[PDB]
Amino acid sequence: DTDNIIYSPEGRLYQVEYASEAIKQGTCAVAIKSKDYVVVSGLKKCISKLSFPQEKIFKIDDYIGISMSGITSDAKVLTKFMQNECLSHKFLYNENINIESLVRSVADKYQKNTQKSSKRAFGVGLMIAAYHNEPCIFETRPNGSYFEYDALSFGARSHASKTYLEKNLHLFEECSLEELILHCLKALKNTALAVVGKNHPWQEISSLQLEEYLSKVKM
Amino acid sequence: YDRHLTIFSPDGNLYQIEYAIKAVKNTNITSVGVKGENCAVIISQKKKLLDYNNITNIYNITDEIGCSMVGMPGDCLSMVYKARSEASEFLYSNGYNVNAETLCRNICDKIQVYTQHAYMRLHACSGMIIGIDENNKPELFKFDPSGFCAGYRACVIGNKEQESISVLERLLEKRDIRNTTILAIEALQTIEIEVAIVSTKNRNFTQISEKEIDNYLTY
Amino acid sequence: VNTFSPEGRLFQVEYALGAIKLGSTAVGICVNDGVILASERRISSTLIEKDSVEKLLSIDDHIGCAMSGLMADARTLIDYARVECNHYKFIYNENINIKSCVELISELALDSRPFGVALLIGGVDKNGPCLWYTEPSGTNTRFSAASIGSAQEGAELLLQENYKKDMTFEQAEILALTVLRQVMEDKLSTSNVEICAIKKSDQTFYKYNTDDISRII
Amino acid sequence: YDLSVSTFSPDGRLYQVEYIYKSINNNNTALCLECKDGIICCCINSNMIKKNSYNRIYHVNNNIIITYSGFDGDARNIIDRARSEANTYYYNFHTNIPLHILVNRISLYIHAYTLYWHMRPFAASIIISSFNEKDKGDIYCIEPNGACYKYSGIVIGKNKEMFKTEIEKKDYKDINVRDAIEDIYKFILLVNFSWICKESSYEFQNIHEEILTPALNKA
Amino acid sequence: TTIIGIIYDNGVMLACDSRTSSGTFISNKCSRKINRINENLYVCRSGASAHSQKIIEIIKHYCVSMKNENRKKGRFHEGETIYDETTYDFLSCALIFGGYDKIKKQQLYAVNLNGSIIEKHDFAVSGSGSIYIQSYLQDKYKKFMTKKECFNLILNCVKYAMHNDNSSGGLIRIVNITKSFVEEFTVVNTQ
Amino acid sequence: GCVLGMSGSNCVAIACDLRLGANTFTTVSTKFSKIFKMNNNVYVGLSGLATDIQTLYEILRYRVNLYEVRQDAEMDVECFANMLSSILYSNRFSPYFVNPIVVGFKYEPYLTAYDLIGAKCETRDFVVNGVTSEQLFGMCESLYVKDQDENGLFETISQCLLSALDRDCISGWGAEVLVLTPEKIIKKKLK
Amino acid sequence: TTICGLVCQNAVILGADTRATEGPIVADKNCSKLHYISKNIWCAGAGVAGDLEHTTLWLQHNVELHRLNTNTQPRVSMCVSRLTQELFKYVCAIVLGGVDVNGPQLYGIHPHGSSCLLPFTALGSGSLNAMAVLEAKYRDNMTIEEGKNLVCEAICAGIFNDLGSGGNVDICVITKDSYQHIRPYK
Amino acid sequence: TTTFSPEGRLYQVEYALEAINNASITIGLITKDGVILGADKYEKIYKIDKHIFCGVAGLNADANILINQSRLYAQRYLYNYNEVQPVSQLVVQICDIKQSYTQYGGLRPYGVSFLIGGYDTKDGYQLYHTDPSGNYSGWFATAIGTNNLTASSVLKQEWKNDMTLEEGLLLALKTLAKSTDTEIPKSEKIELAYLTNKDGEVYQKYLTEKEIEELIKLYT
Amino acid sequence: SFSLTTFSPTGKLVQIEYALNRVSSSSPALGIRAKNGVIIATEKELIEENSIFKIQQISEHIGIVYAGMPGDFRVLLKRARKEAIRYSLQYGSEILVKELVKIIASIVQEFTQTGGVRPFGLSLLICGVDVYGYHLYQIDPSGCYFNWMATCVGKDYQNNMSFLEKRYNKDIEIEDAIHTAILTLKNIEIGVAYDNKPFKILTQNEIKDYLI
Numbered sequence A: 001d002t003d004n005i006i007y008s009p010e011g012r013l014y015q016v017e018y019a020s021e022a023i024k025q026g027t028c029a030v031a032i033k034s035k036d037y038v039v040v041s042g043l044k045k046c047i048s049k050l051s052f053p054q055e056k057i058f059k060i061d062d063y064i065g066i067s068m069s070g071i072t073s074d075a076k077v078l079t080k081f082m083q084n085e086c087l088s089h090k091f092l093y094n095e096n097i098n099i100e101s102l103v104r105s106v107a108d109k110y111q112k113n114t115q116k117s118s119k120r121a122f123g124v125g126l127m128i129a130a131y132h133n134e135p136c137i138f139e140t141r142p143n144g145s146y147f148e149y150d151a152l153s154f155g156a157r158s159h160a161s162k163t164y165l166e167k168n169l170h171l172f173e174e175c176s177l178e179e180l181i182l183h184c185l186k187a188l189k190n191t192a193l194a195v196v197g198k199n200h201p202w203q204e205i206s207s208l209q210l211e212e213y214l215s216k217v218k219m
Numbered sequence B: 001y002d003r004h005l006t007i008f009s010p011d012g013n014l015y016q017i018e019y020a021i022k023a024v025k026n027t028n029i030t031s032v033g034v035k036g037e038n039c040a041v042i043i044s045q046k047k048k049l050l051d052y053n054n055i056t057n058i059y060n061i062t063d064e065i066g067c068s069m070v071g072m073p074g075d076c077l078s079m080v081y082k083a084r085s086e087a088s089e090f091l092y093s094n095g096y097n098v099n100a101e102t103l104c105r106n107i108c109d110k111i112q113v114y115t116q117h118a119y120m121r122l123h124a125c126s127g128m129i130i131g132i133d134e135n136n137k138p139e140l141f142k143f144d145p146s147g148f149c150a151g152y153r154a155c156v157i158g159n160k161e162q163e164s165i166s167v168l169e170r171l172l173e174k175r176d177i178r179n180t181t182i183l184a185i186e187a188l189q190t191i192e193i194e195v196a197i198v199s200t201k202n203r204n205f206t207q208i209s210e211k212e213i214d215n216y217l218t219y
Numbered sequence C: 001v002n003t004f005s006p007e008g009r010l011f012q013v014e015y016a017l018g019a020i021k022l023g024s025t026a027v028g029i030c031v032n033d034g035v036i037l038a039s040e041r042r043i044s045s046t047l048i049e050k051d052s053v054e055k056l057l058s059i060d061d062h063i064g065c066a067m068s069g070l071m072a073d074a075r076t077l078i079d080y081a082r083v084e085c086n087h088y089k090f091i092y093n094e095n096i097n098i099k100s101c102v103e104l105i106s107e108l109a110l111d112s113r114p115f116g117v118a119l120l121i122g123g124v125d126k127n128g129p130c131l132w133y134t135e136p137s138g139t140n141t142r143f144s145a146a147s148i149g150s151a152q153e154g155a156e157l158l159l160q161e162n163y164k165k166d167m168t169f170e171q172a173e174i175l176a177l178t179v180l181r182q183v184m185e186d187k188l189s190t191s192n193v194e195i196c197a198i199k200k201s202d203q204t205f206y207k208y209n210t211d212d213i214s215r216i217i
Numbered sequence D: 001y002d003l004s005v006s007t008f009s010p011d012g013r014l015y016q017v018e019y020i021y022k023s024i025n026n027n028n029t030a031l032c033l034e035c036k037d038g039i040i041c042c043c044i045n046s047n048m049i050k051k052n053s054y055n056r057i058y059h060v061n062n063n064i065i066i067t068y069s070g071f072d073g074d075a076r077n078i079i080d081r082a083r084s085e086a087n088t089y090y091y092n093f094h095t096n097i098p099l100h101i102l103v104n105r106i107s108l109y110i111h112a113y114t115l116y117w118h119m120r121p122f123a124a125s126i127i128i129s130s131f132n133e134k135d136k137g138d139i140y141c142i143e144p145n146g147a148c149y150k151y152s153g154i155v156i157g158k159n160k161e162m163f164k165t166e167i168e169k170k171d172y173k174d175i176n177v178r179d180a181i182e183d184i185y186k187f188i189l190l191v192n193f194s195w196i197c198k199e200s201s202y203e204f205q206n207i208h209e210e211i212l213t214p215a216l217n218k219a
Numbered sequence E: 001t002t003i004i005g006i007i008y009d010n011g012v013m014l015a016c017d018s019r020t021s022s023g024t025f026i027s028n029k030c031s032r033k034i035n036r037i038n039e040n041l042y043v044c045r046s047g048a049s050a051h052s053q054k055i056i057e058i059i060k061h062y063c064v065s066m067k068n069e070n071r072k073k074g075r076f077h078e079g080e081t082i083y084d085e086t087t088y089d090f091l092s093c094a095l096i097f098g099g100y101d102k103i104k105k106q107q108l109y110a111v112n113l114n115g116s117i118i119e120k121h122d123f124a125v126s127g128s129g130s131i132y133i134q135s136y137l138q139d140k141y142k143k144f145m146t147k148k149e150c151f152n153l154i155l156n157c158v159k160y161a162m163h164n165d166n167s168s169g170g171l172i173r174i175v176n177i178t179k180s181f182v183e184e185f186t187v188v189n190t191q
Numbered sequence F: 001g002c003v004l005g006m007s008g009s010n011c012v013a014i015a016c017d018l019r020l021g022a023n024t025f026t027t028v029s030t031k032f033s034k035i036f037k038m039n040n041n042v043y044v045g046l047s048g049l050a051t052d053i054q055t056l057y058e059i060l061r062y063r064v065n066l067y068e069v070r071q072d073a074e075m076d077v078e079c080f081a082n083m084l085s086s087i088l089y090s091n092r093f094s095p096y097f098v099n100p101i102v103v104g105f106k107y108e109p110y111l112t113a114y115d116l117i118g119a120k121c122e123t124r125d126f127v128v129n130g131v132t133s134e135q136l137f138g139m140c141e142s143l144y145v146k147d148q149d150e151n152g153l154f155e156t157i158s159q160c161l162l163s164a165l166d167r168d169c170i171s172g173w174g175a176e177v178l179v180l181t182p183e184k185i186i187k188k189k190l191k
Numbered sequence G: 001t002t003i004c005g006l007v008c009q010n011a012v013i014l015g016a017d018t019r020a021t022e023g024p025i026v027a028d029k030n031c032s033k034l035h036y037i038s039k040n041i042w043c044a045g046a047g048v049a050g051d052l053e054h055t056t057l058w059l060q061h062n063v064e065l066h067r068l069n070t071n072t073q074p075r076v077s078m079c080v081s082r083l084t085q086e087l088f089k090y091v092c093a094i095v096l097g098g099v100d101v102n103g104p105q106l107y108g109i110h111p112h113g114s115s116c117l118l119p120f121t122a123l124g125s126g127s128l129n130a131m132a133v134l135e136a137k138y139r140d141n142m143t144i145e146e147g148k149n150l151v152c153e154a155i156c157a158g159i160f161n162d163l164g165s166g167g168n169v170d171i172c173v174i175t176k177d178s179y180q181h182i183r184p185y186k
Numbered sequence H: 001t002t003t004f005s006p007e008g009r010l011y012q013v014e015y016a017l018e019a020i021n022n023a024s025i026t027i028g029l030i031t032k033d034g035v036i037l038g039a040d041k042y043e044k045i046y047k048i049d050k051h052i053f054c055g056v057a058g059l060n061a062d063a064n065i066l067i068n069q070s071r072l073y074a075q076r077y078l079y080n081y082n083e084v085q086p087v088s089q090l091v092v093q094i095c096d097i098k099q100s101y102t103q104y105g106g107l108r109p110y111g112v113s114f115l116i117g118g119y120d121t122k123d124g125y126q127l128y129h130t131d132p133s134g135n136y137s138g139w140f141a142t143a144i145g146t147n148n149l150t151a152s153s154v155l156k157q158e159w160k161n162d163m164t165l166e167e168g169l170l171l172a173l174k175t176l177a178k179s180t181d182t183e184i185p186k187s188e189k190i191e192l193a194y195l196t197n198k199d200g201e202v203y204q205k206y207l208t209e210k211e212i213e214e215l216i217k218l219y220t
Numbered sequence I: 001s002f003s004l005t006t007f008s009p010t011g012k013l014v015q016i017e018y019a020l021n022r023v024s025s026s027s028p029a030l031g032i033r034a035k036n037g038v039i040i041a042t043e044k045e046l047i048e049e050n051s052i053f054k055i056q057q058i059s060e061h062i063g064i065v066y067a068g069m070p071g072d073f074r075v076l077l078k079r080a081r082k083e084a085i086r087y088s089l090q091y092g093s094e095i096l097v098k099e100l101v102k103i104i105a106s107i108v109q110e111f112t113q114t115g116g117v118r119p120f121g122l123s124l125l126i127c128g129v130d131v132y133g134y135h136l137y138q139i140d141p142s143g144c145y146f147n148w149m150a151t152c153v154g155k156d157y158q159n160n161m162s163f164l165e166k167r168y169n170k171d172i173e174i175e176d177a178i179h180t181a182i183l184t185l186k187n188i189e190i191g192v193a194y195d196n197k198p199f200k201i202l203t204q205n206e207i208k209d210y211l212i
Ligand SMILES: */C(=C\S(C)(=O)=O)[C@H](Cc1c[nH]c2ccccc12)NC(=O)[C@H](CC(C)C)NC(=O)[C@H](Cc1c[nH]c2ccccc12)NC(=O)CN1CCOCC1
Pocket: F113, F114, F115, F116, F117, F118, F119, F120, F121, F122, G001, G002, G019, G020, G021, G022, G023, G027, G028, G031, G032, G033, G045, G046, G047, G048, G049, G050, G052, G053, G124, G125, G126, G164
C-alpha cells in the first residue's frame, strides 16, 4: 500500500486522510457570520518566552482574507497562489475577484495535488472568509471538497468551539459587530482577531483596542 | 516480482498477458464472426431500466469496416476510437480506405506497445474485424491482447472460444446472406442477439435490420 | 519522500530535524540597538587555517545569518538567498526587508531532499533590528532572542534568564557572550567565537575584530 | 496485485478499479429519474455549520445535466472537463453538443487514468442527461473505468439498490408529468431536485422551492 | 472562376464550370470544381487550386471523423463552421456549402476569404464570373421554383458568366441536391 | 573555381586551377587545392566558395570514413555521389555555392557532377564544374576522343586547362592534374 | 523540359525529353525524367532537377516501403496524395502514369501541389508546344502503337520548338502487368 | 545505478565486472612495430580508426555500442580538429560514457571491459584497458578475460620492453595457448592482429599464421 | 527511467536469459547457406494461414524469420524495413545485409539496456544478398548477431541443430539443399535468395514439387 496513488480494499485513500491527522495539531480558529459582516479569530501559538507568535490570519484581497490551519509551508504557498490569482483576475478584467470562483480555483489546486501521486496532499485547510457582495465563509478540506459555512471552527481543541456553535445562532445577535465579536471570543474561549464586511473590507483589530476588547468577555 | 508487472517468467513465459486474456475470457460476452461466401456476418449476444437498444459489441470504424469488440469496455471504446483514428489518418495520408488487415496493423501494434512498455497496462479487449478488401474477397481478422493480426475464415471470441471451434466446424462443412447468416444466428443457438454484415450494400458495413432478426431465427 | 505518517506529521521533514543537533551553537540576540550574533569558533581542528571558517555569513550588506546543521546545505541556501535578496534591489535601492528575505528562503525551504539546516537571519531594515529563525521545516519565526545548534537545547534558558529589550548593543554583547561562553569547553577567546553585529544606526554587518572580543574578555 | 490501477490480477480482475465501486457504494445517493415528459435528476447530500446549500447537480449547458456520487473533488473536476468539452465543441462546430458524444468523451476521460501506473483513477460515477421533445430523454450513467450506459433512470450512490425497487416502478415513474417528485419524497423513506421537461422549456433548472413545497406538504 | 447555387422548391442546386486556367493559359480544362465532402452535402470551391484542394481533403476527413463518431450524418452548418475556423488560419479560398440535413432540409452557406455568411432564402455566387451574374440572377429570383424550372436559371446564369469572363470555363457540372435521396447530375455544355 | 574530369579507356583524370583569389580577384593564394581523395578509387573536386569547400570535404571525410569503418567495403562511387547529392540538398544556404565533381573507378570509370542543390549528372564522360566551365565544355567537347592512353588523355585534359585558364581572370596558376589507374596514381604540376 | 504522356487502350504511355540545362549552357547531354516509382506506376517530373531527384526519391521509397508493408499494389492515387501533400508543405511539376484496379490513371501535379487526372498531359517549357500537336491528334482508346508514335511526335515538336528543350527522347508503356521501358526512343 | 555499499563499494559494477571476468580471454602486447592484440575467438577485435584498434571483453553485444560510439567520437574529433584522435583522448571519451552510466541514470551499466591500442604519433604506440567502473590504465601487456592473472603472470614472469613482432607474437601465444592448450587455439578459434602503422594484417588462415601454428615446432 | 533488467550477483542478466528461454520455447525455423544461394524455412481450420508466414521481405534481397513473439517480430520487422529504406535514402544503393543486421542488433540492444522496457522475445534469421555474397545472420535477443552457414531457432532444436551440415558435404547446389532443409525440418514455409538477387516464397504446390 503506502501511496495516495492507490485505494485501500476498504475503498479509502489513506494519504489524504492523514492530512487531518496533520491539521489536528494546528491551533483552533473560529468564524462567525453576521448578515452583513464576517468575523474571524485565530490563536497564535507561542514557541518560546521570547518568540513572537505567528499570525494565522492573512489578507488576500480587499474584502477577502483567510485563516489557514495546517502545516505552514503549504499554507503560504496557497496564499501566494490565491493572491497571484486574484491579482491576475483584476489585471485581466478591471474587476474584483468572485469569492466563489476563487474558492473553486484553490480547491481545484488541492485536488490537483491530492490526485497526482508525486505531489503530496496539502496538510492544511483554508477557512476563507469574505464576500463580493454578501458575506460568506468557505472551508477547504485537504482535498477537492469545499463547503460554504455559517460558522466554522477548526484545528486543535476546536471541539469546544464546535459544540458551542450550537448554543448560538450564527446571527442570533448579528446586528451589532460587538455582539458578533463577543460571540467570536466566547466561541474561541498574542491571540488574533479580524473583521470584514459592508463598508470596511478586511481588517485586523489586533490593536491594543483589541486588548481592551478582550476584557469584555469577562467585563 | 515478475507477476506484478509486464515482465518475463523464470520459465521465460509472460504473465500479465495471460491475465488480460482472462479478462476477456471471463467477460462472458461470446461472439461469433463467420465469413460468408462473398459476404460476412458478425454476431454477438446483446448482454432492468438498462437499454438493450443502446447495447452492442459490434461497431463500425469506416463504412467498409466493422469490428466487434469484447473485453474491458472502456478499453473497447478506446480501441474503437483508435481504430477510427487510424483509418482516418490512412485515408488522409493516402486516399485509399484501409484493407482490414491494414487496420489490423494499427490495432495490433497499438495494442502491442503496451506489452513491452511496463507502465501502461496490457490491453484488456479483443474482437473481430470485417471489411471488403481491395481484393474483392471479404476479409475477416481478429486480434488478441497479445499482438495478433490473426486471420480466419471463421472465428469466435469471449467466454467461449476454441470450445466452439469444433462446434463451428459443423457449419464449416456447410459453409448468400440466407445461407451464411443462418450459420451465425445458429452459431449463437449452437452454443436479442445482434447480427452484422458487410454485404448489405456489398461494400458498406451495416448491422442487419431489426425486423429481419426473427425470420432467420425462425427458419 | 512526502509519505504522510499515520501520526499525521510529515515523515521526511521530521526525520530531518536531527541534522541541526549536529550543529555547533550560535546565539543571535536582537536588541534595541542592533542584532548581536555569536557562534562557536572552537569547532576548528588544530591544523585548519586558524579562524578561517565562518558559520556566520552575510546574505546582503545589512543581513547576517548564522547557520545550523550541515555546512553544505547551508552554503546552498545562503547562495540562493544572496542571489535573490540581491535581485530584489535590482534598480530600486531598498534592500529586502528581513522578514521577506527570510520569507523567500523559507518558502523555497518548503519544497530532492529537505534541507538539513536551520538559519538565524538578522538585520536592520524597519526602524528596529530583526531576528528570524528558519526551521528546516520551512516554518519561519521572529524571535526577540534565540539560539541554534544542539547547545541551544539548554542554553536557551539562559536567554530567558537575562533578555531585557533595553540594552546597549554592547550590553547585549556581554549577554550573548555570557550565554555562549557557558556552553563552550574552552575558556572563551576569539578562537572560541565568531561574533558579528548589525547596529541600529550603522545597520552595517560587521564581524568583530579578534582584538575586540579579546578586549571585552 | 491489488496495489496497481494497471496490473491485472491473476484472475484478470482489477481490484484497484474495483475499489472505486466501494467508494461510490458508500457515498451519497444521487437518483436521476426520467418522466415521459422530461427528466429529473436529484440528490440527497448528507454532509452551526451551513446546511442551506451544497448542490451536487450541475450542467454543461443550459440543457444538459450532470449529477454524481463519490469523492466530491474528482467529480467537480470532471464537471470542469465537461464544461470545457461542451464549449470546445461549441467553438469548433457552432452548435450545442449532442449528449451522446459528450458522454463518450467523459467515458474516455475517466478511462484514461486507469491505464497509468502513477495516476489515480477518479472515484466518482456520473449521471449525465438531456431531454427535448425531439431529443428524447436519456440518462447515461458512467461507472469509472468506462462503460457508460444509457438508462431509463438509474439511482446511484450509497443506497441505490434499495431505491431501485421504487425506480423499478418505472411505469409509474414514466406516468408522471410533474408529480414524480411528490412520489419520490415518500419513495426515499440538502436535497437537490431539478428540471428538464417541456415546462422547463427543456432548459435545465433548479426546481422552485415553492414547487418543492407541494412535494413535502403532500405527506 | 464561377460557382453558383440556387435552392429550388426544396433542395439546393449548385453549379460550376471547369477550366482551371493556369497563368492566363488553360491547363486542366474539364476538371471538377464542385466536390463531394459527403453525399449529404457538396462543396463548390474556387480560388487557388492547391490551397483549395488541400483544404478540401482536410475538411473531408474531419467530416468523416464526425460522421462515424456520431452515427448521424454531420449537419452541413458544422461543415461550414469547421471550414470557417480552418481557413481562418496565408491560406486562401472561396467556397459554397450546399446539402441536405434533417435539421434544416436545405441551406446554402458561403465562405468568404475568411468569414462565412448564409443565404437561406437566397442564392450564393462567387468567383471572377460571379460579378456578372449577381445582378442578372438576383432579378430572375423567386422562391417557388422547382428543379425543372430552376435548372434553367442555373444553366443560363452559368452560360452568361462564362460568356464574358475569360477565366470562366467550358464544360459545367451541376448538382440537384434533392430534399430526398440521391441527387445526381451529369456534365453538360452550351455557349 | 575550376575543375575537370576526363575519362579514359583504363583511366580517369581530374584537374584544377590552384588559385583561391578573393574579392576583385586579387590572388590571395596560389597553392589552394580543391581536389581531394576520399578513397583510393574515389575523388572529389570542389569549387565555388572555398569556405563551403573545406566544410563540405570535411563532412565527407567524416561520413565516408565513418561508413567505411562501420561497413568494411570501401565505398562505391554511386554511394558517395548519391549521398553527396543528399548532403547538399538539406539546405541551399549551407553552400552559398559549391560545385562538387566526383570521379573514380567502380573497374568501370565513374564521373558525376553535382549542382549546388544536389542536382546531379551521372555522365559517362567528361564534366566540368567551375567558374570557367563554359570554356571547359567548349574545348573538351571537340578535343575529346573516346578512349586514350593516360598520357595522351593527359595532354588532352591539359589542353583544356591551358586553353581555359588563359581566357578567365579567375583561373589559377598551375594544374593539379591527376591521371589514375586502379593500381596507380599520377599527380603532376603543369605551368 | 517537354514531358508528354498519354493513355491508350489499356496502358498509360509516358515519354519525355533527355537534356538537362543550366539556363545558358547545357549542363548535360542526357538525364532521367522518367523515374520508376513502381513496376506499374512511374513519374515524369519537370522543373528544378534537384527538387525532382529529392521528392522522387522520397516518393519512391514511401511507395515501395508502403507496398512492403501492405498486400495491395500501391495503387496510383496514393502516390498523388503523398506528392501533392509534400509540395503543399512548401518547385517541381510532375506527370505520373500508373495502372491499377481502376483505369490506366495519369495525373499532372503543379508546383503549388495542385492535382488533376488527365487524358493526356505535358509540362515544362515544351508544354505549350506539346499541347498544340498532342490535342490535335488525340483520340480516346488509341491502339497502344498509336501512343507509341504519337507521344514521340509531340515530344519531338516540343523539342525542336524550344530553346530550352532538345536532345534524345525516351518513352515507356506502363501496362498494369508491366512497365516496358526503352532508354532511347530516338 | 545502485547506491554505495555499507562497507563502501558498488554492487552493480561488481556484478558487471563479475560478468567480464567470465568472458573468453583477450590479451595485449607492445613492441617496436606496434601493439599486437590476441583473442580467444566472431572477429572479437575491431578497428576504431586506422591508427587505433580495440580488442574487447565482456558482454560483447553491449560492446557493439561502445565500438559504434568510439568510432563516432574519433570521426567527430577529426571533424573538429583536422587531426586523427590520440588514443588517450579516445579512452577518455569512452570512460566518460561509462562513468556517465554508472552514476546518474537508472540504466544498468555496460557489461564491457575492453582493450584499446593505437599510434598517436605524439606518444608513440599506446595500450589501455577499460572497466565498467570507468577506470582506465595504460599498459605494456594485458590478459583480460578468464584467467586474467593466470595468463598475465606468465608474461609478467617472462616479458621485456622490446621484441620483434615475429618473436613477440609467439610470446603472446605461450600464455594464450598453453592456458587453453598447447596447440588448441591454432587448432581452433583464434584471432591475433596488429598495427604496423595501420591494420591488423595477420589472419588465422593467413600463411603468416602458420608461424603461429609453427610456434610448437619451436616450442617442442 | 529504470532498466528493468539489472545484473545478477553471478554477473548474468537474468531477464535476457528468460527471453532466450522463450525463444527456445517457441517455434522452429531453418536457414541454410548454399554456395550459390540461401534458403530459409520454418514449421508454420478457419484460419486462412496464407496471410501468415514467419518469412518476410525486408528488401528485394533480404528476408527473415523470428522464433519468439509474433508481435515482437512485427515491430522489429517494421523498424528494420524502415532502416533499409532510411539507408537507401541516405545513400544510392541497397543496404548490405551485414549493415542491416548491425542496425537491428543495436535496436535490440537498446531495449535490453534502456529503461522501462521488456527485452525482445525472439531470435532472427536474415538471409540476404550483397556484392560480397549470399548471406545468413542470426540475431540473438542479447544483441549478439552472428554469422552462420546454417541455423535453427525453435523448439526441440538441440537434436535438430545438427542435421543441417550435410548439404555442405556435396549438396551446395540449391536444388539439393532443398532436401537438406525440409528433411532436416521433418505446415511449412520457404523463402530462397537464389542466383538472382530477388527471392520468393515457394508455393505449397512447389512444396509438393519437392515432396516427391
Ligand atoms: C527542366 C528545365 S525547364 C526550364 O523546362 O523547367 C529541367 C528538368 C531536369 C533537368 N535534369 C533532370 C533530372 C531528373 C529530373 C528532371 C530533370 N530542369 C532544368 O533545366 C533546371 C533549370 C531550372 C532553373 C528550371 N536546371 C538546373 O537546375 C541546373 C542543373 C545542373 C546544374 N549543374 C549540373 C551538373 C550536372 C547535371 C545537372 C546540372 N542547376 C541549377 O539550376 C542550380 N540550382 C540553382 C537553384 O536550385 C538548385 C540548383
